[PDB]
Design a protein around this ligand. Structure first.
Ligand code: CL
Ligand code: MG
Ligand code: MG
Ligand code: MG
Ligand code: MG
Ligand code: MG
Ligand code: MG
Ligand code: MG
Lengths: 614, 612, 612
């Protein structure tokens, strides 16, 4: 009906599509605000006639290759997950295995065995013990000396007939009757996202396929293994590509310089998506690269067996399921009725010149009077290699409905462009990519006289949050800001955060203990400069950008007599904005709105959370 | 009985002594390892007859001024104030109150003064508009404000309430309340400046503005202040003053710090940190020593009688009475200790730079022809003090065949104010040498100590000094650093006392000032060749997890041998104050790591096989 | 994967096959060690699309004759009868049922016949006016009578009920019910004589008076009877008969016992005990075989199809279909038994006294030039049979390096009737010789078997043989005796089946008969030279606890080395039917006891240390 902090609860969220023969499966997720829980329903849709059947309180659908049956997960309260198998015809099901700590399940070609990947920890009640690095990872909790577990599960007898473990952050996939195992390669310390060793495992014995390469195995058609990466990388920020390995490594993407978002191989054909200029598009490789779905949108996921299906999300609509027969046909409209009565604001794309480059930019125009001006919010995506674009961004439609101009850009370092365009940001953070945004703003103001230049706020999460702190220390233009799970100091990010030990050396430069860049590019040392009211938002479970990042910056700013507030969420990780409990997320949305309302649209003194939140 | 990780559970811990007339009240606390809980039993003794009655599962005893009745607390999740007639010990639930930090009797034996706090208390998120965002052992402030309740114990109602800013305190003075509040300039000045008000019937009058002391007690005629009238540094020795309407310092001739003190009918009882001891004195208009020697007086109370809790290096506290002489009231742990070997430390003086410093060591039972390894303890601080109190680890490791050694480097409490102030901005320089010197001198008096094996451990500042040691020195063969500091800058912007404490102890303009990076172990991490164990807890806001974890992460990035154990619960003091099962595990770990990385080295550390 | 105490939990156990039209249904059972529970899942297979569908946490599948619906039970302490539509498997709850032992469809695919029991159910005490006071696996009778309910599954009501004496049974015959009730003279004669009635609408006529068979099945024109018309000994082979109102025995020229039988459309499907095998046959008016080989057919059903469970010495049952050839329907354990080694027993013939006997032995993997210890297993009985079924302990111990050796002594099932009758009042005489002689022939065949370590073990009658062996012989270096017999007199008076069984197998006039003392191991106890482990369970009324405990106490009084393990739960059959955790402990115990007293003898058995 109207846009507010709850409206997101009214959307149907689709995820994790799967297909075999003429069947499609996916997960329907709702945010239940009353019970404060997410509900999951696997939907199984027959092609031809649109008929649906359901598996309630379940997720991770996997359809057996023979299309006779489907495997899934139910989660528990008692804190344990169960693996179930149901027959596809009647949907009667049985409980196969009770498994905690299971991150994935994949069918074998025989529609009998499953491959489960998971982890084991030390699990002492009173304390965690760590001999390795890092001590934690975001959304995974404290590693507590975690290792990777592999289970070959028989769904008939319901037993684990094979099990072995590997180092932390390994992964595996079926290759025929054998398993392809990717283990992060270790020199001084495991080199994550950089180098892997790859093995071929069958019946307790393995052989090494690759030594210290830059790619890992994401899929197999049983003849060929699909490799995701480059064979070798100078920078993890380099565009990931895809390779087919028959015993020779043949890259099919060499001519195309873009990063591969997602890929799957079936029957020698390879379906994959790319980041391009704010979009994520779907292509097929039959031995030539062919276009499938390309436009202003993001393809969130896809699967192909006899048929090709994918989820398509847009700037104004959450994902719906589509089928491609050689023409695109839309299979589901879940949110059709809600958005019939709900106004959406489409972003207008513009080009602008910044230094030596021409960049992409977008703004949303609220409804205002021909005789009046509107306040502006500048969003800055996480990164640096994140990308803004044609996906669905809640806050943006929210604030547009409330009368704000919405403006965002893809500064150098962003994904969706040339590899070089991305690498440029390296040890450049806060210099050129910040000018990119200021120039994007300026071109925007010129395109839109009705935007009031005197009220312009800025907000961002993660890297965006760092950019928000930076913007307030380095510029006079912003009347308000909201910084979330950001970075005020690069050094602690290097030592503290989950990925800090590798990522920072690359993005901020080497020799962190010495290198003066770390204090030079960090907003924390520029604190005396901030003249704007600022809200900091953080979450206690976020190991990507740890609590200190927000809290130090807040404490110091307060010591300098600045106006700043900190909201610390008791639960939730780095992604808590989208992934936290519905009630949590709602309160954040309410806070986000109200701050921009009282600090930007019209400035008023102080912030009273008790009175404001009701 | 033998010494191990479980041995601390067998001790009776006494606390919070109280007296009115001839009656004595105190708390008996046992650590139950099975139920993994602490058990509290209020014991009430008749000064004669030795007779003991009890109040089960309760604490915070307060005896009425008329000694007819006693107030106490029972904690569940809510706390309840109870009142029992002392004669039959029959009791009634008076007020059910969560977040009450204290209770005190009005002179009339009717009204109570209860000092709590109120917070925003949203379930999903905390919101902070003030500083700091948290305090160690108090949790996240979440906009905390101080509350004051005047409770009538008869009708059982709250007849008065008002609130003050965070960290405010109050006490009874006659029929009014003395309210001390932290003074605000930009941010509240904690431990530095206070405004003091006198409060009655809704109206207040400001007694003091921007003073370095606050009101710690009253006899109702006079007000006892704790602090100085003005301080250039918080690290200055805190003294006592009698305010009758004119401030009079009674301590002006003694340069020492007061630990504790109270006023009863014109007379002032107090304790001082002196050279590794805490001694009890009485001021009747002259300073007269009551209990002095090698020990700590951990608490005391006096009305018609003077009682106190004495604790020594070989023993946990017991209750003592003094008439003209000392008489030991209770032996709780005697039977147990009869069966347990105890080690008295040996006092020794040493030369460090220009000063003569105190030192101590404990000598194990050693084979006539053999040498023993050494464990160096560094106390919290900088203004903490080692001495004659009871340190579990020391006894434990002693009975385990280790040399125990510790010193009081400059900056330590218990000496001249200047002796303490010397450390300011000097952290890791002079005091470290003081430790290096004390060590040498020790090795000299004890040739039996094996210089080839010397370890070091410490908590908080002691943890920092441990880190510092392994970066600055090839002397130590291993270390255990608990809740310490690898980096001073974050200690400034992150922890609870950082904003002020760091500026004074480290330097001003922290963002610029290079001292923060120079005295910070994290930058010297390349220099560490000794195996290190890093210990932390998730609830400690004094020295946040970043201090231990960043250090551990960096060291691992450099290929050093290091380990980290992070306790899912507990604050800065979790080692002593953690849950029994928690504390035992830490003891067993502490124990095993010194065994395996120091006494006889070995490769790797397996916490699974080693714990059980 | 490796063989150990826990390996049995990795196998899928199928039971209770049923079929109608093109449909098949059976029960999948798994032993869950973590939850310590047995899990059942009804599996329904279509012979059309070769597909599976499931009914979770359920058993007793019964498919309606028209193939449209399936009835089943869910237990938990109640039980409930459900009905599901076979196409979608949507299910509705029909009747909440306590004490229902069986359910069967009427030809109308509407009504069920439930047979069950009712007792006195006093909370504090059981009261018994009949015999016996208890039955193994049924608990104490407490006055129990058999109850019969006719249930309409549409309206979900009991339309008909009546009751008969204890141990009565019934089956549908057309629209009527054939009731078999035990014939009473002084006490009911169980397993000897029955009276048979035809019951409809509250009315009954008597078909048979005091006959030695009862009614097993009906095709609605014909009643299948199981027994003989007249048996002198209950140990006589039970045969099958067809009653159209004249009685025709179909097996007359075959002297073998029928294990199971069913009748559909004038044809009779049945199994036979033959020489270690249980084989499937059909009778179309001439006996013709279906599945014959080294195997046991554990169950079967026929309507439009013939399906059966087949189990072998190396594999648990899998399901098969017979179209005129055998086709394997299920391999549940196939993947497991790729990675798990199994041992096919070698069959051998030997001579004993006047007979030629069957024997089997498993040869372990041995270091050549060295020898392996032996374990003789004795089957229950005496009319039990060893053979081609799957015996866990045998696979377990063979994998641990033991020879396994067992025989069917005279009195065993699966040979001529006279062969079975030979053992009567002979227990411990000839059949024990049969075992000794078999062992001797085996030692010849396997010179690598070490005759200086040979153990012996058995359950029930086999525990009897184990006791007997240690008192009657010097051959054995150790033994494990489970739920056996030391003293026959108490077997007769105390045990569930004693009053009839012991008169037939041991002898008549039990109180006056010297055989009861003479064949009892207990009276020879002074003879035992070999360490012995006794195993019992408190719930076994087949061989009551005194059997093990008296033998134990006596042996101790004589200074012998003996131990006793008493399982707090479980009946006679607890080794297989006990709770998974229970069964695991039993296995671990069995294994470790043979290891430490047989393979290499050591002093003492410390159970707290030996099992985890
Ligand atoms: Cl299956
Ligand atoms: Mg809802
Ligand atoms: Mg199951
Ligand atoms: Mg990448
Ligand atoms: Mg009351
Ligand atoms: Mg002080
Ligand atoms: Mg019903
Ligand atoms: Mg029979």
């Amino acid at each position: 009906i109207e846009w507010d902090e709850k409206t997101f609860t009214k959307f149907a969220y689709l995820s994790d599509p799967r297909t075999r023969k003429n069947l499609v499966a996916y997960v329907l997720t709702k945010a239940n605000l009353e019970s404060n829980k997410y509900e999951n329903t696997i939907v199984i849709e027959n092609l031809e006639d649109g008929s649906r059947k359901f598996i309630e309180d379940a997720s991770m659908p996997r359809i057996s290759p023979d299309g006779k049956k489907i495997a899934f997960m139910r989660f528990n309260e008692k804190k344990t997950a169960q693996i179930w198998v149901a027959d596809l015809k009647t949907l009667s099901a049985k409980k196969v295995l009770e498994a905690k700590n299971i991150r994935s399940i994949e069918w074998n070609q025989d529609s009998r065995r499953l491959l489960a990947v998971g982890f084991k920890r030390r699990e002492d009640e009173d304390f965690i013990f760590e001999d390795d690095v890092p001590a934690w990872f975001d959304n995974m909790g404290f590693f507590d000396g975690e290792k990777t577990t592999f289970w070959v599960i028989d769904t008939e007898g319901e037993e684990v007939i094979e099990q072995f473990e590997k180092p932390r952050f390994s992964s595996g996939i079926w290759h025929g009757d054998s398993i392809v195992v990717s283990v992060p390669h270790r020199d001084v310390i495991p080199r994550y996202f950089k180098y892997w060793d790859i093995y071929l495992w069958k019946d307790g014995e393995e052989e090494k396929l690759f030594e210290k390469v830059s790619f890992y195995a994401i899929d197999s058609d049983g003849e060929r293994i699909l490799l995701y990466g480059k064979p070798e990388k100078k920078y993890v920020s380099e565009h990931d590509k895809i390779y087919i390995y028959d015993g020779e490594v043949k890259g099919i993407l060499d001519d195309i310089d873009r990063e591969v978002a997602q890929a799957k191989i079936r029957n020698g054909k390879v379906y994959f998506t790319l980041f391009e200029e704010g979009s994520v598009n779907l292509y097929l490789w039959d031995g030539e690269v062919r276009e499938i779905a390309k436009g202003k949108h993001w393809i969130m996921g896809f699967d192909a067996d006899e048929r090709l299906i994918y989820l398509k999300e847009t700037a104004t609509r959450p994902a719906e399921l589509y089928l491609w027969d050689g023409e695109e046909r839309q299979l589901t409209d879940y949110n059709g009725l809600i958005f019939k009565k709900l106004k959406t604001f489409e972003p207008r794309h513009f080009r602008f010149k910044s230094i030596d480059l021409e960049l992409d930019g977008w703004y949303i125009k609220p409804e205002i009077k021909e005789g009046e001006k509107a306040p502006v919010i500048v969003f800055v995506h996480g990164g640096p290699k994140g990308m803004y674009g044609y996906y669905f961004k809640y806050e943006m439609q929210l604030m547009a409905s409330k009368g704000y101009y919405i403006v965002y850009v893809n500064p150098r370092g962003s994904n969706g462009y040339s590899e070089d365009f991305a690498l440029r940001v390296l040890e450049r953070t806060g210099l050129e990519d910040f000018q990119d945004i200021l120039n994007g703003i300026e071109e925007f103001l010129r395109l839109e006289p009705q935007a009031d230049r005197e009220r312009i706020g800025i907000t961002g999460i993660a890297y965006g949050g760092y950019m928000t702190n930076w913007a307030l220390t380095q510029s006079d233009l912003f009347k308000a800001g909201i910084s979330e799970n950001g970075i005020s100091y690069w050094l602690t990010s290097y030592a503290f955060s989950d990925i800090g030990l590798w990522f920072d050396k690359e993005v901020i430069g080497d020799n962190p203990l010495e290198n003066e860049n770390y204090r030079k590019l960090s907003p924390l040392f520029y604190a005396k400069n901030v003249k704007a009211p600022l809200l900091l938002i953080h979450s206690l479970e976020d190991y990507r950008c740890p609590l200190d990042q927000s809290l130090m910056f807040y404490h110091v700013l307060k010591d300098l007599g600045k106006e700043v507030y900190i909201a610390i969420f008791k639960k939730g990780a780095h992604g808590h904005s989208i992934r936290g409990s519905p009630r949590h997320r709602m309160k954040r949305y309410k806070l986000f709105m109200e701050f921009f309302e009282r600090k930007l649209k019209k400035y008023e003194e102080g912030f009273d959370v008790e009175k404001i939140l009701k």
